[PDB]
Amino acid sequence: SNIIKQLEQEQMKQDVPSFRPGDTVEVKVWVVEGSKKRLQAFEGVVIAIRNRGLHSAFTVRKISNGEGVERVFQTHSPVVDSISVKRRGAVRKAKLYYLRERTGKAARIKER
Amino acid sequence: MIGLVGKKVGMTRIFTEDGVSIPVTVIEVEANRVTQVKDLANDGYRAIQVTTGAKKANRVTKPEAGHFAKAGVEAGRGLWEFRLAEGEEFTVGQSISVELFADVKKVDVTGTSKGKGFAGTVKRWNFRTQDATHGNSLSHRVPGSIGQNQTPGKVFKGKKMAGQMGNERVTVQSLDVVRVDAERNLLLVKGAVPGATGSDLIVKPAVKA
Amino acid sequence: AVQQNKPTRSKRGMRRSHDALTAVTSLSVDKTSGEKHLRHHITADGYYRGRKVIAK
Amino acid sequence: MRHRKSGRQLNRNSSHRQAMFRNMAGSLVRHEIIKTTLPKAKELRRVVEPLITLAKTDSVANRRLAFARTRDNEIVAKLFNELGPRFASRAGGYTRILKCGFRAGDNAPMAYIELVDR
Amino acid sequence: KCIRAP
Amino acid sequence: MIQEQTMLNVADNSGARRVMCIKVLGGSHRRYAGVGDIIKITIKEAIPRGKVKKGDVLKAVVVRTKKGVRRPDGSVIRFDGNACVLLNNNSEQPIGTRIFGPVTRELRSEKFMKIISLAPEV
RNA sequence: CGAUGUCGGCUCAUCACAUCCUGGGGCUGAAGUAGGUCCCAAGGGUAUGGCUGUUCGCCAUUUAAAGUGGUACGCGAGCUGGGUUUAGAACGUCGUGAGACAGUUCGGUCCCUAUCUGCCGUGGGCGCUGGAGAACUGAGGGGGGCUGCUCCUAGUACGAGAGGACCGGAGUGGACGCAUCACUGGUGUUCGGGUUGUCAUGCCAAUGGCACUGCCCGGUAGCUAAAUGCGGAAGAGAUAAGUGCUGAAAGCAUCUAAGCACGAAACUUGCCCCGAGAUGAGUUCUCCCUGACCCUUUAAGGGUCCUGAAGGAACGUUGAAGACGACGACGUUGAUAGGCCGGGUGUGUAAGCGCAGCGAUGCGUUGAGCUAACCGGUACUAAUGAACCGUGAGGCUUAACCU
RNA sequence: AAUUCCUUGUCGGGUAAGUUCCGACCUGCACGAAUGGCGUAAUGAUGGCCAGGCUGUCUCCACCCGAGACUCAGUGAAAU
RNA sequence: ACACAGGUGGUCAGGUAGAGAAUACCAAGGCGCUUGAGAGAACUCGGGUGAAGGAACUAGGCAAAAUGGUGCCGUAACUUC
RNA sequence: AGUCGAGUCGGCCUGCGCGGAAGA
RNA sequence: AGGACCGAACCGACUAAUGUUGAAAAAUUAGCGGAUGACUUGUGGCUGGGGGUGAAAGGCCAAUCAAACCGGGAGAUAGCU
Ligand SMILES: [K+]
Ligand SMILES: [K+]
Ligand SMILES: [K+]
Ligand SMILES: [K+]
Ligand SMILES: [K+]
Ligand SMILES: [K+]
Ligand SMILES: [K+]
Ligand SMILES: [K+]
Ligand SMILES: [K+]
Ligand SMILES: [K+]
Ligand SMILES: [K+]
Ligand SMILES: [K+]
Ligand SMILES: [K+]
Ligand SMILES: [K+]
Ligand SMILES: [K+]
Ligand SMILES: [K+]
Ligand SMILES: [K+]
Ligand SMILES: [K+]
Ligand SMILES: [K+]
Ligand SMILES: [K+]
Ligand SMILES: [K+]
Ligand SMILES: [K+]
Ligand SMILES: [K+]
Ligand SMILES: [K+]
Ligand SMILES: [Mg+2]
Ligand SMILES: [Mg+2]
Ligand SMILES: [Mg+2]
Ligand SMILES: [Mg+2]
Ligand SMILES: [Mg+2]
Ligand SMILES: [Mg+2]
Ligand SMILES: [Mg+2]
Ligand SMILES: [Mg+2]
Ligand SMILES: [Mg+2]
Ligand SMILES: [Mg+2]
Ligand SMILES: [Mg+2]
Ligand SMILES: [Mg+2]
Ligand SMILES: [Mg+2]
Ligand SMILES: [Mg+2]
Ligand SMILES: [Mg+2]
Ligand SMILES: [Mg+2]
Ligand SMILES: [Mg+2]
Ligand SMILES: [Mg+2]
Ligand SMILES: [Mg+2]
Ligand SMILES: [Mg+2]
Ligand SMILES: [Mg+2]
Ligand SMILES: [Mg+2]
Ligand SMILES: [Mg+2]
Ligand SMILES: [Mg+2]
Ligand SMILES: [Mg+2]
Ligand SMILES: [Mg+2]
Ligand SMILES: [Mg+2]
Ligand SMILES: [Mg+2]
Ligand SMILES: [Mg+2]
Ligand SMILES: [Mg+2]
Ligand SMILES: [Mg+2]
Ligand SMILES: [Mg+2]
Ligand SMILES: [Mg+2]
Ligand SMILES: [Mg+2]
Ligand SMILES: [Mg+2]
Ligand SMILES: [Mg+2]
Numbered sequence A: 001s002n003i004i005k006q007l008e009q010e011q012m013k014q015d016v017p018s019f020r021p022g023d024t025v026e027v028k029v030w031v032v033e034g035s036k037k038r039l040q041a042f043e044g045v046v047i048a049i050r051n052r053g054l055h056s057a058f059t060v061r062k063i064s065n066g067e068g069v070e071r072v073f074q075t076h077s078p079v080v081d082s083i084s085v086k087r088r089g090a091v092r093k094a095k096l097y098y099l100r101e102r103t104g105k106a107a108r109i110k111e112r
Numbered sequence B: 001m002i003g004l005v006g007k008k009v010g011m012t013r014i015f016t017e018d019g020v021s022i023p024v025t026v027i028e029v030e031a032n033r034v035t036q037v038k039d040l041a042n043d044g045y046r047a048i049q050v051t052t053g054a055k056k057a058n059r060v061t062k063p064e065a066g067h068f069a070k071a072g073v074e075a076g077r078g079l080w081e082f083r084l085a086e087g088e089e090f091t092v093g094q095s096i097s098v099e100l101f102a103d104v105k106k107v108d109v110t111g112t113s114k115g116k117g118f119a120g121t122v123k124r125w126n127f128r129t130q131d132a133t134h135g136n137s138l139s140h141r142v143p144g145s146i147g148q149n150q151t152p153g154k155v156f157k158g159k160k161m162a163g164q165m166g167n168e169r170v171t172v173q174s175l176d177v178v179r180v181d182a183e184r185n186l187l188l189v190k191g192a193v194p195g196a197t198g199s200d201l202i203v204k205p206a207v208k209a
Numbered sequence C: 001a002v003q004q005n006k007p008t009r010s011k012r013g014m015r016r017s018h019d020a021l022t023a024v025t026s027l028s029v030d031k032t033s034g035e036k037h038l039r040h041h042i043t044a045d046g047y048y049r050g051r052k053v054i055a056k
Numbered sequence D: 001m002r003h004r005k006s007g008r009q010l011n012r013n014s015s016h017r018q019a020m021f022r023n024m025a026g027s028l029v030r031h032e033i034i035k036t037t038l039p040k041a042k043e044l045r046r047v048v049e050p051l052i053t054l055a056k057t058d059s060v061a062n063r064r065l066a067f068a069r070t071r072d073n074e075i076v077a078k079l080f081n082e083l084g085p086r087f088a089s090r091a092g093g094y095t096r097i098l099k100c101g102f103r104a105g106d107n108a109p110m111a112y113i114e115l116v117d118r
Numbered sequence E: 001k002c003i004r005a006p
Numbered sequence F: 001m002i003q004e005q006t007m008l009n010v011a012d013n014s015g016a017r018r019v020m021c022i023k024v025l026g027g028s029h030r031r032y033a034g035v036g037d038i039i040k041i042t043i044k045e046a047i048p049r050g051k052v053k054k055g056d057v058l059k060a061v062v063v064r065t066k067k068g069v070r071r072p073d074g075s076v077i078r079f080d081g082n083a084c085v086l087l088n089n090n091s092e093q094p095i096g097t098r099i100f101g102p103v104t105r106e107l108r109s110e111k112f113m114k115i116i117s118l119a120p121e122v
Numbered sequence G: 001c002g003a004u005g006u007c008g009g010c011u012c013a014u015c016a017c018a019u020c021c022u023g024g025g026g027c028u029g030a031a032g033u034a035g036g037u038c039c040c041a042a043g044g045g046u047a048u049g050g051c052u053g054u055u056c057g058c059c060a061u062u063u064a065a066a067g068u069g070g071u072a073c074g075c076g077a078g079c080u081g082g083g084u085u086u087a088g089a090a091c092g093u094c095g096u097g098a099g100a101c102a103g104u105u106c107g108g109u110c111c112c113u114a115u116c117u118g119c120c121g122u123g124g125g126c127g128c129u130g131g132a133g134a135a136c137u138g139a140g141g142g143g144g145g146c147u148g149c150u151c152c153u154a155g156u157a158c159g160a161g162a163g164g165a166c167c168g169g170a171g172u173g174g175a176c177g178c179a180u181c182a183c184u185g186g187u188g189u190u191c192g193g194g195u196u197g198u199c200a201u202g203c204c205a206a207u208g209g210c211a212c213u214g215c216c217c218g219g220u221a222g223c224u225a226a227a228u229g230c231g232g233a234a235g236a237g238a239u240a241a242g243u244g245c246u247g248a249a250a251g252c253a254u255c256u257a258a259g260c261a262c263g264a265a266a267c268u269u270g271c272c273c274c275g276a277g278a279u280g281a282g283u284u285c286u287c288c289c290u291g292a293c294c295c296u297u298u299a300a301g302g303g304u305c306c307u308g309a310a311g312g313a314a315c316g317u318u319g320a321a322g323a324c325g326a327c328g329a330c331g332u333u334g335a336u337a338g339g340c341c342g343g344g345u346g347u348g349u350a351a352g353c354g355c356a357g358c359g360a361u362g363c364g365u366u367g368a369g370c371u372a373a374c375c376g377g378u379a380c381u382a383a384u385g386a387a388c389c390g391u392g393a394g395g396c397u398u399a400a401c402c403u
Numbered sequence H: 001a002a003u004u005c006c007u008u009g010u011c012g013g014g015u016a017a018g019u020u021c022c023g024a025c026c027u028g029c030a031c032g033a034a035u036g037g038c039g040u041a042a043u044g045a046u047g048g049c050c051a052g053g054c055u056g057u058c059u060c061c062a063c064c065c066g067a068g069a070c071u072c073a074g075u076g077a078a079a080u
Numbered sequence I: 001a002c003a004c005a006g007g008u009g010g011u012c013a014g015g016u017a018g019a020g021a022a023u024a025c026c027a028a029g030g031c032g033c034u035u036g037a038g039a040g041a042a043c044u045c046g047g048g049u050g051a052a053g054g055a056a057c058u059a060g061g062c063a064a065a066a067u068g069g070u071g072c073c074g075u076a077a078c079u080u081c
Numbered sequence J: 001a002g003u004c005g006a007g008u009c010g011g012c013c014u015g016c017g018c019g020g021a022a023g024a
Numbered sequence K: 001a002g003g004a005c006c007g008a009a010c011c012g013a014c015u016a017a018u019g020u021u022g023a024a025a026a027a028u029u030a031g032c033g034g035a036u037g038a039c040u041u042g043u044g045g046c047u048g049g050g051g052g053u054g055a056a057a058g059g060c061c062a063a064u065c066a067a068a069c070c071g072g073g074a075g076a077u078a079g080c081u
C-alpha cells in the first residue's frame, strides 16, 4: 500500500485541471489509424467523477448525431491528451445520472 | 530454474506510452536466503530450502532457530524448497534476489486461494439453479439428482457436492513479467494471482515454453 | 427418514465418545486477594490482576 | 462470507441494534459502569468512545450531534460538562471491559464495561 | 397419488 | 450485449425501423453479440417503401450497444440504445446508403469499411 | 398385490461404442475442392427457438458436430404435475336405464427432522517404538485434454475452365475451466444527502422515532460477473488400423516366421492438485531430557521421593481462516483487536451567525459538515505473573565397524 | 366443433418458425332444432389465442436485510 | 385434548392527515406475545436491489414486476340504446 | 520355381488350432 | 331507482407460497369475489335415518354419510388370511 502508493504516484499526471460534475468539458483523445496519430475532441457534460488516485475516472455525456453517448475516461491514461472546462455547471448532486432520462430543454444545466 | 518466495502486495496498473493499461499484481520479493542444500547423496534429490522475511525472535522455536543457526541466516517467516535443475548450484547462506527474474518473460505464480468456506453446488461447481417459481417446492439451489437407481445403487466417488471451497494451493501459469525492480524488491506480473493481499506467493519461471 | 434396525448400545457409546466434558486446565490465583478465578475474568470478590474493581 | 466486514448483528435488525446501543450508551455515561454480555460490551466501545471524543470539543453543533446520537440531554450535558474534560488529554481507550463469568439464566458470557477513570 | 395407479 | 429476442434500432436507411435478433452467429451456444458482431435478424417494423420489408430475415452488424465497448486503457464508450446496420444475407455488405449516428473504431476492418466511410462520427 | 410411485419435463449425471464432430488410415466410378465406402479410435466436445403433456417429429435459424444406446422407459425420501390415474361437469357415441369409452373437453391435496450403506466436506483418537519443531520424497489418487475463422505458404500444386489444396506457419475467436477485483459495473437496511405523512424532544430553529431501509438519489470496504488475467499444449515413450525395410519357410514372391523401422485427440508420461493410516506408516535438518532409591511374582516389572526439558495445550486479543472443530496472526521484549491521530473515499456547501427578500427561499462564511468495513501511524483500552500437559538418554537379535 | 377417429385434414391469417388460436372449405368416423338450433349487447376469481406495458420467469445469476439451519446453556419429542 | 397464530353476538368510537369505521402516525388505555446467549457456512423460509437483454422461462407470464388519486380534456367497433 | 539339378503339383480322408467374434 | 358501480366492517374462498410428526385433524401470508340483497347475523323453534333436508355436489344431518350414532339379535357368517 505504501509500495503501491509509490508505484501509482510516479505514473500520475500533474496537469489535470479542476472540474466538477455538471461542468462542460472538452477531452482531447489520441486516435491511431496505422502509423498516423490524430487528436479527437469529445465535448460534453461531466455526469460522474471517480476520485481514486491513479484509478481516477470521469464520465462525459454528449448528444452526438441524434444519439446519446457516454465515455468513461481514465483520467491518468496517456490516451487522454488534454482536459479543458468550457463551462461551469451548477448542480447539487455528485452524479447526474438523472440526465439520461432528460433531453433538450429538460437537460439544461445552469451555469455556476 | 529455481523460483523465489514473495508476498502479494496488491494490484495496480501500468499505463504504457502507447495507451494500454496493464493490470498488474505487485509481488514483493525480498532476498530468499538458502537455509539448506539437499544433495543426491544425503537426501536422494537436488533442491534448495530458502527462507524470506523476518520472524519475531521470541516466536522462533529452539528447533527452528538451530536450523537457521546451522545455515548462518536470520530466521524468516517460513521455509520453502525449490528443485534444482541439472547445472544449477547454490551454497548455504546465499541470498537470491528478484534480479533472478530479470530476463524471465513469463512466470507461474502459486498461492493459497481466498477461502469461501462451505460453498453450495451453485457456487462451487456452477450447477444450474432450478425454477425460482413454476411450483418449485424448497428446491431452488439444491443439487438435483445425485445418482441413478438400484443400478448402481450408490453415489459415485468424485460426485460434485457442496463443501469447503477455496483456501487451497492454486497455480496460475504463464503470467507476463511486466517489471523487475531490484531496488524496491518488486516483481510486477500481468494479471491476477491467487490469494489475499499479504499472502505468500511462490514465483517460478513458466514451465510451459 | 428412519432406521431399519435398532442401533446397539455399542454404537450409542461410540457416538458419545466425543461427548466428554473438559475441566478447566487450571484456575488462576489473584496476586493480592489470593483467590482462585478463571484466567482473564474478575474474582468473585471483585479483584482483577491485584486491584479491586467493581467493589461489590 | 464476511471478509473484512465490521459490526455484529446480535440477532437483531438494524433499527433494534441502533436503539439498543443508544440506550446502552446512555446507561454507561450515566452510571459509569454497567454489566452486559461480552459481545455487546465490545460493540458498545464503538458507540460510546466516539461520543466522548465528540464531547472533547464543546460547540452547539457538537452538542446537537451528540443529541442526535443519544436523544438525552442529561447524557449530552454529562458528556461535554464532565467526561469530555475528564478525558481531554487521553487518546482513545476511554472504556475498559472486564470479563465476569456467566449469566445464570442462559449461560451468556458477561462483562463489566466501565469508564477508565471511574 | 396412487402407487402403480390404474 | 445483444441476444436472441433483443430488439435493435437501425442505424441506416435500409427502411427497417426495428429489428429483432434471432441468432448470435459464429459459435455453438454463443450467448452475446457486441459491437462489430454479425447477427441474424427479422424485421419487425419497416417504413412503407424501403429496400426491405416486415418479416424479412437477414444479417446485421451491431454498431452501438448500451453495454458499450471497452478500450485498451480501461475506458468505456456506452450508447443510449442498441443499433445495427442491415447486411445482405449472402454477401455481408450494407443494404442502405446512409449510416445514422456515431459508430466505433471496432468496425475498422475490411468487411465494414463502407459503414465507417459513411458514418458521421468515429 | 400386509404397495417395487406410474409418461414426459427439470436438476444431476454415469457407462457402452454399433463414432455425430475433431484425430489416424485403406479402397474409390479419389484431378483439385468436395464426396462415397470400410478399418482404427471413446480424449474431449456434441445448439437455441416455434408448435405439441408429449417421447418422437415437423419447422426456423445456427454449429466442427447437433451421435446411438444402457443405467427400475437413470434420477418424485431431489423439484414439477402438462399428461396419465378417483370423486364434479359436458360433448359425440353406445345403452330402455343405472352407466360406458388408451375418444374428447373444463376442473381437480405430490408427505418424510437421514439410523445404516454411499457420496461431499471437516475434525477427534491411537498408531508409525524416547520425545519434539520443521522441510520433504512420492507409492498411489484426482483434475485437465473441445474447437472455429482469418491471414501467410499460394491464387501455388491440381484443373479445359470453373474453381482450388496437402504439408507447415502466424493471428484472433466461441464454448468450457481456474484465479482475481486493478479496471467497467452490481450489491452496499453499518456512509452522506433529498423528500411525504405523523408523533416527540417545552416552543422557534435544529433533531430523533415510526411508516417495506417510509419512499427515493448517490455510494466506501467486502462479496462479486457482465469485468480481465491465465489454461487445454509442445515434447517424450509404447502402440491401433495402416505403411514399410531386410527376409526365408516356398530357388520366385512375401511387412514376419528370425531381425529392423514408421504410425493417432485412445494408452504411459509431460501440466495442475491431493498424497507416508504408502500399518510397505519412508527421508532430511534442527531441538530437548545425562537424578536418586525401595520392593516383589526379578522383568520391555511395579512403586516412592526429587525433577518437569524441548515443545504443546489452555486462556486472552483476533484474522482476506472458519458451521463447530481446524488453520493463521498476536499476548507488553506488544500494532492482535478496539479506540485515537493523520489521510483517503463517499456524499455534496452542516449548524450557528450575517446579508438579501413581504415570504417560500437565495447568497456569504464554505467544497462546508458528516463520513462503515480502507490506508498510514499510535500502547489510550484489552491481550497477566502464573498454572496445566509433556519427562529424566529411549527393547531384543544379528552384522559391519571400537582397527 | 366442449362433437372430426383418420388428423398436425386442406386453404388463408398471424410468427423467422404456430399439433394451439382466428377465418374458411365440407370428405358431419359420430351436429341439428325446447334431454332445444343458430345468433347475441352486457356480465364471468370461466376455457383458448394474440399484443402493448412490465419485469430475476429466463439467459444466469450476484449482493444485501431479516427468521431458521450452526455453537453454548436450560428443557426435551417422533415415525421406525 | 394444550397458557393452541383458529372460532365467538352486542355496546363505546379521541387527535393529525384522509371521502372514510380505509391507511399512516399518536391519545386515553394496554402490551413486548414464558427459553435465552452467540455466530454470521451450505440450504430453506420472508423480504430489498440489480449491468445488458426482456417471456428467450414455462404445460401455462405460475410467481413477480407493473398500473393505481383528484380535477379537467378526450374516448372506437358493437349495442338490447 | 526363377542353363538348372531333385523332388514337385493338386485333390481326398482325418487330429488339434486360426479368422468370422460389438455393450453398457 | 337498482339481485346498479368503486370500496372497509361483515359474508365468502379464485390463485400462489408456506405449513404437511402443522401454531391449525383445513390454517397463515400476499393477492381475490360479494358487499341494500335470491344479503348477512344473534336468540329460540320445527323436520329423524330408507328418514330428514338439499339453487342437486350423493351434498349435509355433532371432526362419522350410496343409508348417522348408541345399545341389542351377537360369539352374524367368513370354502379366506
Ligand atoms: K407445488
Ligand atoms: K403389486
Ligand atoms: K476415407
Ligand atoms: K470420444
Ligand atoms: K445417457
Ligand atoms: K420402475
Ligand atoms: K416424474
Ligand atoms: K426411494
Ligand atoms: K424432498
Ligand atoms: K385412457
Ligand atoms: K446398511
Ligand atoms: K471490482
Ligand atoms: K463495490
Ligand atoms: K420526521
Ligand atoms: K511417516
Ligand atoms: K477447516
Ligand atoms: K451554505
Ligand atoms: K451554513
Ligand atoms: K468532503
Ligand atoms: K361428432
Ligand atoms: K326433454
Ligand atoms: K332460444
Ligand atoms: K339408516
Ligand atoms: K359365533
Ligand atoms: Mg473466507
Ligand atoms: Mg437454467
Ligand atoms: Mg407443498
Ligand atoms: Mg420456494
Ligand atoms: Mg453392490
Ligand atoms: Mg455427541
Ligand atoms: Mg477488520
Ligand atoms: Mg437466536
Ligand atoms: Mg423501520
Ligand atoms: Mg412390506
Ligand atoms: Mg469400433
Ligand atoms: Mg478410457
Ligand atoms: Mg424412469
Ligand atoms: Mg416431495
Ligand atoms: Mg427416488
Ligand atoms: Mg393434471
Ligand atoms: Mg391429450
Ligand atoms: Mg379408461
Ligand atoms: Mg371411442
Ligand atoms: Mg484422466
Ligand atoms: Mg478495491
Ligand atoms: Mg457503482
Ligand atoms: Mg442503495
Ligand atoms: Mg420546526
Ligand atoms: Mg413512536
Ligand atoms: Mg405505532
Ligand atoms: Mg526373398
Ligand atoms: Mg488498534
Ligand atoms: Mg470528497
Ligand atoms: Mg441535515
Ligand atoms: Mg384429433
Ligand atoms: Mg394451417
Ligand atoms: Mg409466442
Ligand atoms: Mg375454426
Ligand atoms: Mg347435441
Ligand atoms: Mg321437434
Ligand SMILES: [Mg+2]
Binding pocket: none
Ligand atoms: Mg342450451
Ligand SMILES: [Mg+2]
Binding pocket: none
Ligand atoms: Mg442444546
Ligand SMILES: [Mg+2]
Binding pocket: I003
Ligand atoms: Mg404462550
Ligand SMILES: [Mg+2]
Binding pocket: none
Ligand atoms: Mg365477528
Ligand SMILES: [Mg+2]
Binding pocket: none
Ligand atoms: Mg386500521
Ligand SMILES: [Mg+2]
Binding pocket: none
Ligand atoms: Mg442469513
Ligand SMILES: [Mg+2]
Binding pocket: none
Ligand atoms: Mg424487487
Ligand SMILES: [Mg+2]
Binding pocket: I050
Ligand atoms: Mg436486470
Ligand SMILES: [Mg+2]
Binding pocket: none
Ligand atoms: Mg437496466
Ligand SMILES: [Mg+2]
Binding pocket: none
Ligand atoms: Mg416460449
Ligand SMILES: [Mg+2]
Binding pocket: none
Ligand atoms: Mg423452452
Ligand SMILES: [Mg+2]
Binding pocket: none
Ligand atoms: Mg399472477
Ligand SMILES: [Mg+2]
Binding pocket: none
Ligand atoms: Mg406486486
Ligand SMILES: [Mg+2]
Binding pocket: none
Ligand atoms: Mg472357429
Ligand SMILES: [Mg+2]
Binding pocket: K004
Ligand atoms: Mg351490487
Ligand SMILES: [Mg+2]
Binding pocket: none
Ligand atoms: Mg360456502
